[PDB]
Structure formats: C-alpha cells, structure tokens
Amino acid sequence: SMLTELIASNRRSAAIHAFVDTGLSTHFKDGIYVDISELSRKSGVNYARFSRLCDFLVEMGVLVSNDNKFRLSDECHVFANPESFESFMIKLEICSHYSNAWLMYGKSLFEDDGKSAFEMAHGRPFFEYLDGNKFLKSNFDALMTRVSNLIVEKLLGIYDFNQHNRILDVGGGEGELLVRISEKVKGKHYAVLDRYSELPVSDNIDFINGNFLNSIPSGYDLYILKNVLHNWSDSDSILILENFRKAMDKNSSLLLINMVKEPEFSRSFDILMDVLFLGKERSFTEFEYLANQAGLVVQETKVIDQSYSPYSFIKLQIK
Amino acid sequence: SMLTELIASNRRSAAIHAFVDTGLSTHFKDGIYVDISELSRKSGVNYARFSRLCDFLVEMGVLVSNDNKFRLSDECHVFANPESFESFMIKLEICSHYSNAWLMYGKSLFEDDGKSAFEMAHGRPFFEYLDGNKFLKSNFDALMTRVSNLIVEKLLGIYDFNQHNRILDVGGGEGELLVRISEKVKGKHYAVLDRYSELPVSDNIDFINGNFLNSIPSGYDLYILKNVLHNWSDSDSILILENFRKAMDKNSSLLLINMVKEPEFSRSFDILMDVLFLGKERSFTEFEYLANQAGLVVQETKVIDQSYSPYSFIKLQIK
Numbered sequence: 248s249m250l251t252e253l254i255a256s257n258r259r260s261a262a263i264h265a266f267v268d269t270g271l272s273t274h275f276k277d278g279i280y281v282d283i284s285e286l287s288r289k290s291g292v293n294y295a296r297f298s299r300l301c302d303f304l305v306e307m308g309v310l311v312s313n314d315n316k317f318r319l320s321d322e323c324h325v326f327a328n329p330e331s332f333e334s335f336m337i338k339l340e341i342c343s344h345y346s347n348a349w350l351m352y353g354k355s356l357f358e359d360d361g362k363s364a365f366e367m368a369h370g371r372p373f374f375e376y377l378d379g380n381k382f383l384k385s386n387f388d389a390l391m392t393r394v395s396n397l398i399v400e401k402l403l404g405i406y407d408f409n410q411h412n413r414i415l416d417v418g419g420g421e422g423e424l425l426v427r428i429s430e431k432v433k434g435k436h437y438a439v440l441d442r443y444s445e446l447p448v449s450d451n452i453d454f455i456n457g458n459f460l461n462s463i464p465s466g467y468d469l470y471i472l473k474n475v476l477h478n479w480s481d482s483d484s485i486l487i488l489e490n491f492r493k494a495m496d497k498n499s500s501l502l503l504i505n506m507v508k509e510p511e512f513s514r515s516f517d518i519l520m521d522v523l524f525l526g527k528e529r530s531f532t533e534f535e536y537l538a539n540q541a542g543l544v545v546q547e548t549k550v551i552d553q554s555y556s557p558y559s560f561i562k563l564q565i566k
Numbered sequence: 567s568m569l570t571e572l573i574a575s576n577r578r579s580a581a582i583h584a585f586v587d588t589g590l591s592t593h594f595k596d597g598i599y600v601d602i603s604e605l606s607r608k609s610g611v612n613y614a615r616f617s618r619l620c621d622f623l624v625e626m627g628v629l630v631s632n633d634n635k636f637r638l639s640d641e642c643h644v645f646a647n648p649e650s651f652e653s654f655m656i657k658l659e660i661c662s663h664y665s666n667a668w669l670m671y672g673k674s675l676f677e678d679d680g681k682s683a684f685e686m687a688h689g690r691p692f693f694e695y696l697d698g699n700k701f702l703k704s705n706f707d708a709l710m711t712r713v714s715n716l717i718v719e720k721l722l723g724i725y726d727f728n729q730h731n732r733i734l735d736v737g738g739g740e741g742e743l744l745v746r747i748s749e750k751v752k753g754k755h756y757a758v759l760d761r762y763s764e765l766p767v768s769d770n771i772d773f774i775n776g777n778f779l780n781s782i783p784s785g786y787d788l789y790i791l792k793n794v795l796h797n798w799s800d801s802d803s804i805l806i807l808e809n810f811r812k813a814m815d816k817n818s819s820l821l822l823i824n825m826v827k828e829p830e831f832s833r834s835f836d837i838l839m840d841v842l843f844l845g846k847e848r849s850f851t852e853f854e855y856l857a858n859q860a861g862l863v864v865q866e867t868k869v870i871d872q873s874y875s876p877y878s879f880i881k882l883q884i885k
C-alpha cells in the first residue's frame with residue numbers, strides 16, 4: 248500500500264546505498280545499457296539477487312529497463328561517478344552514526360538540555376565527534392567540497408571578487424571554494440578558517456586554525472560564511488555574525504551564502520539539521536533578522552539555483 | 567531535488583518513527599485536530615521543534631493542517647493506535663538491527679556462503695538471533711499477530727473451516743490465526759507448531775515446540791502455512807513442503823497462504839526478505855512449482871486482497 252511503502256521509505260535509501268556504495272553503479276557510466284549476466288561474471292555480484300535489486304531500482308526510477316538490460320536514468324547519471332556529491336551523500340545518509348542519531352530524534356524532542364539527537368547517540372556534538380572519526384570527517388568534508396565545486400562558477404558570475412584584496416572563507420573546511428575562486432581571480436590574499444588539528448596545505452592559501460564562536464580575525468575586506476548558520480541555534484548564529492561585525496571595518500563585506508527555506512521544497516533537510524546539530528533551515532527574512540540583531544545590514548540579495556536546493560546570497564556590511 | 571529526496575527516503579521513515587514510537591501520534595485519536603501549543607504543554611515535547619516535524623508530516627500526507635491545528639490523515643488513523651500492525655512495523659523498520667542488516671546488504675550480494683546481510687551484521691540468522699533478543703522477538707511476533715488478526719475475517723469467508731476436525735497451523739507464532747478461527751469455528755481440535763523456549767498457554771489450543779525443517783506431525787486433516795515460505799530459500803521451501811507431503815494422507819489438505827509477487831505492487835518487501843533471510847517474494851506460478859517438486863498438487867487457488875499486499879490462497883493435497 249501507499250502507507251506501508253511510506254513507512255518503508257528507508258528501503259529506497261538502503262537499495263541505492265547497496266547499488267552505489269559497492270561501486271556496482273560505476274559499471275553504468277555514460278547511460279550505457281548493462282547485461283546483468285555479464286556484470287555478475289565481471290564483478291562477482293550474485294545474478295539472481297542483484298537482478299531483484301535492479302527490478303526495485305527500476306520501480307524507483309534509478310534504472311531504465313530495455314531488451315533485458317538496465318541503464319541509469321538521465322538524472323541518476325551521477326551514481327556512475329564515485330566523485331559526485333550524490334555518491335558522498337549516499338555514503339553518509341544511512342551510515343550507522345546518522346541512523347543511531349535518527350533513533351534518538353523522538354527522545355531529543357522531550358529534552359531542553361541543548362543536546363542534539365546525534366550527541367544523545369554518540370556522546371559529543373557532531374563536529375567535536377568528527378575530530379575522532381576519520382570515516383565521518385573525510386566523507387562529510389568530501390561532501391562539502393563537492394557542493395562547493397558545484398556552486399563556485401555561478402558565485403563568480405553574480406559577484407565581482409576582483410574588487411577585493413584579502414579574502415577569508417570562515418568555516419571553509421578543506422578550502423575548495425577559495426582554491427577554485429583563487430584559480431579564476433588571481434593576485435589576491437586567500438585565507439581559510441576552520442577547526443584544524445593539522446593545517447591543510449594548498450598554493451597561496453593561508454589555513455588558520457580558529458573558532459568563529461570565539462573570534463573572527465580582522466584585516467580582510469571580504470569574508471565568506473557558506474552553509475555554516477544552518478548547523479547552529481539562533482543565539483549561536485547571532486554570536487557568529489556579532490564576531491564578524493567586530494572583525495569588520497566600514498569598507499569590509501560579508502557574503503552570507505546558505506541553502507534557503509522555500510515552501511516549494513521538502514522540509515526533510517530541516518529535520519536532519521535538527522537531528523545532527525539542533526540547527527534549522529531559514530528563509531531570507533529569518534537570515535536578515537539574525538544579521539540585524541548582530542548589528543549588520545543587507546546591501547545586496549540574490550537567489551542562486553542549485554539542482555538539489557535554492558541558495559540565498561546575502562552581502563552584509565556593518566550598520 | 568526529487569533525486570536528493572529519493573536518496574534521503576530514510577528521513578520519511580525516521581520522522582514517522584519519532585512521531586509514533588514516542589507515542590505523540592496517540593494524542594491524535596478519532597481524527598481529532600490537535601493544537602501543538604497544548605500538546606507541547608501537556609506532553610513536554612518542544613513546541614518549535616515538534617511544529618517543524620508536523621510540517622514535514624503534512625508534506626508526507628501523515629498529518630492534515632486546518633486552523634493552525636493538525637489531524638492524522640484518514641489512512642494514518644492507525645498511528646493513533648499503538649496496538650496497530652503499522653505501529654509495530656514502524657518500531658522494527660528502522661530499529662538498529664534492521665539498519666545494520668541493510669548496511670551489510672551491499673557486501674551480502676558478493677558472497678555465496680548462504681549468510682544473510684542480517685547474519686553478517688549480527689552473527690546468527692534472524693530467527694536464531696531473536697531467541698536471545700526480547701525487543702526483536704516480542705515486536706516481530708506482535709507484528710505477525712496483528713496481520714493474522716486482519717486477514718482472519720476474509721479467510722473464514724473464502725474457505726469452509728467447519729468441514730475439518732483436526733487443524734495444525736505450522737509456524738503459527740503466538741497462535742493468533744487459530745485462536746481467532748477457533749472463536750468462530752467451534753468443536754475442532756486446534757494445534758500450533760513453532761519454535762518455543764516456553765510453550766504458550768491458550769484455551770483449547772495445543773502448542774507444539776517443533777521444527778518444520780525436520781518433521782510435521784501427522785494425523786491432522788487441515789494444515790496451514792501462512793507467511794513462512796518467503797523466509798526460506800527454494801531448497802528449504804521444497805524441504806518444508808516435502809515434510810507436509812510425508813505428514814499428509816489422501817484426505818488431508820494444506821492451505822499455503824502467502825503475500826504474493828504481483829507486477830503492480832512494490833518490490834521493497836522482496837529486498838527486505840533478501841536482507842533478513844536470503845528469502846524472496848514468489849508468484850502463484852513459483853509457489854505451484856515448489857509444491858509440485860515436493861509432490862503436492864493444487865486443488866484450488868484464490869486471491870485475498872489485504873490493504874498492504876495481495877495474498878495467494880493455495881489448497882494443496884498429495885498426488
């Protein structure tokens with residue numbers, strides 16, 4: 248029935264995980280039709296049991312069935328690429344750590360101790376836990392790198408980065424957003440601030456071990472804060488933006504770049520942010536309120552279209 | 567995007583689990599519109615965070631919004647009743663044991679040692695593992711009891727049980743099917759065979775600790791095997807049906823009752839049976855083949871429509 252299949256939504260995620268995480272999906276590059284008998288002989292996957300998984304993947308629209316063969320659907324071409332953001336998303340979505348966090352979600356709703364479902368499961372908040380877990384950290388940082396790579400071309404197209412001299416990407420992770428910007432916009436100073444036990448190394452990138460809850464370093468005319476605030480409470484968000492306002496002079500600019508809450512799109516990500524961080528999706532208006540409270544003003548507003556989600560682009564300056 | 571929401575199908579299951587497993591759904595009995603402010607004050611659930619969950623549950627069609635209040639959709643009325651099959655399905659669907667089984671599914675497809683994804687995760691096959699896990703055993707047996715209770719009315723309607731005298735339900739679990747048949751079909755001898763560490767007690771029900779892989783007790787004129795064969799390989803299924811043929815005389819009948827593989831219905835359950843048992847869903851044709859190979863012939867076939875799945879009713883007799 249519709250309802251029992253809704254209850255069993257997890258089966259769709261777990262099916263995709265088996266198909267993509269094993270690397271079986273990498274045999275379906277360039278929309279090629281795959282004979283499962285041949286794939287079974289080449290890969291050593293069980294023919295009868297994988298054929299049954301392929302029938303389910305057809306039902307979900309991941310595979311297209313023709314002439315006793317299967318191809319990826321046009322939109323699922325990304326599953327053939329293990330470097331795609333969707334491949335890294337699949338690795339994490341139903342990993343044990345996320346699963347066990349989701350199992351504490353119900354209980355998390357009856358607590359007001361500021362402990363995420365993730366912390367209730369694993370004993371530390373998300374990013375603190377990732378310091379001790381290479382699987383989660385490597386794959387999460389990899390995922391953030393892939394979605395950074397996807398938006399950078401559109402970002403360069405809607406904002407003049409050439410006007411700026413000193414650029415700091417705050418919570419920039421592996422720092423791939425600025426590495427890509429630095430390749431198109433030459434002759435600037437490029438710095439990336441995050442939590443680093445060992446500093447990353449990249450050509451003409453200054454990696455700074457820091458904490459945006461404590462302080463943001465002064466002496467940059469461009470600050471970038473991309474996909475950070477949705478990991479934080481309203482109070483922690485205001486604290487971060489206040490730390491920016493203190494670090495900024497009259498001429499400096501802050502680019503607040505985030506996935507933005509719109510009524511046309513699914514709320515599933517809003518619930519994941521609650522489970523992992525006690526974070527939330529915010530509308531442009533809700534972002535603007537937090538900026539105002541922190542003593543910042545909106546100079547420019549733009550919407551950037553990504554395949555998976557709309558993005559708010561908010562240029563901020565001190566009042 | 568549709569694709570990222572497909573990858574994140576698990577979030578739908580986890581949201582329903584948080585809503586139902588906490589008992590919050592039990593505040594929505596009799597299609598009543600609930601004020602979330604009042605529910606938050608009464609239950610101690612966080613208002614803002616539960617309201618966000620309610621928005622996701624409306625999106626999924628579990629909740630219906632009117633006048634800033636929420637009711638269960640008509641089909642989701644079952645979530646208000648903690649004794650419903652749908653409540654027990656929710657409890658098990660994303661429990662840690664099922665999740666960890668699903669995470670071994672990919673690896674299971676490359677092995678041919680007869681070890682299920684579940685056994686690979688947990689160290690024993692499903693039913694053996696349940697002997698040492700009260701959470702899994704009690705909830706699984708409860709789920710089977712609820713779905714037995716749902717089918718009994720239509721089953722009595724399509725077959726004359728009054729013609730029989732000695733009736734054995736094989737792998738009958740808690741014995742709910744025969745207990746319900748017994749209270750509408752009086753004056754018979756009722757027996758239930760399963761794997762019991764302690765024999766259940768029920769009025770005029772003979773509970774038998776047995777093993778249908780080894781032997782079925784003879785002398786019954788009606789045998790019932792409901793929702794067993796989908797837990798077993800084709801070879802183990804033939805063995806079970808062979809043990810019936812040995813136990814049966816000319817006059818005895820075997821009612822093979824099972825969820826049946828139809829093209830119109832989802833293959834998700836077929837994949838779950840692979841993960842948990844190296845089992846599978848079968849068409850009437852495939853069931854008839856197994857029966858024939860065991861030396862049983864089809865006397866009559868009927869289709870029983872249940873809300874969640876179509877059922878095959880197959881009356882079998884010795885050659």
Ligand SMILES: Nc1ncnc2c1ncn2[C@@H]1O[C@H](CSCC[C@H](N)C(=O)O)[C@@H](O)[C@H]1O
Nearest residue numbers: 374391395418419420441442458459473474
């Ligand atoms: N207290 C803190 N100080 C600095 N960085 C922090 C932090 N807590 C979390 N972070 C970092 O914040 C980042 C959030 S994920 C976003 C990464 C990057 N801006 C992008 O959009 O692709 C992570 O890299 C995490 O390590």
Ligand SMILES: Nc1ncnc2c1ncn2[C@@H]1O[C@H](CSCC[C@H](N)C(=O)O)[C@@H](O)[C@H]1O
Nearest residue numbers: 693710714737738739760761777778792793
């Ligand atoms: N070797 C074995 N011998 C007997 N019963 C077995 C068995 N292995 C598993 N079972 C039982 O088979 C049942 C499968 S679930 C089906 C239960 C019931 N017939 C119903 O339709 O609701 C479980 O109760 C399980 O304990």
Ligand SMILES: COc1cc(O)cc2c1C(=O)c1c(O)cccc1C2=O
Nearest residue numbers: 336394474475477478506523555570
């Ligand atoms: C916990 O996951 C995230 C944390 C972030 O700070 C930002 C993103 C994510 C995501 O999981 C994510 C995703 O799964 C798909 C597309 C984008 C993102 C994030 O930007």
Ligand SMILES: COc1cc(O)cc2c1C(=O)c1c(O)cccc1C2=O
Nearest residue numbers: 251655713793794796797825842874
């Ligand atoms: C392990 O799960 C099952 C094993 C069975 O032998 C029969 C059923 C199930 C189910 O999980 C199940 C379900 O989740 C929802 C409706 C029916 C069933 C079974 O009949």
Ligand SMILES: [Cl-]
Nearest residue numbers: 516555570574
């Ligand atoms: Cl997402």
Ligand SMILES: [Cl-]
Nearest residue numbers: 251255835874
């Ligand atoms: Cl089901």
Ligand code: NA
Nearest residue numbers: 353354587588
């Ligand atoms: Na719970």
Ligand code: NA
Nearest residue numbers: 655658659709
């Ligand atoms: Na189940």
Ligand code: NA
Nearest residue numbers: 346660661665
């Ligand atoms: Na889970």
Ligand code: NA
Nearest residue numbers: 346347662665
């Ligand atoms: Na889990």
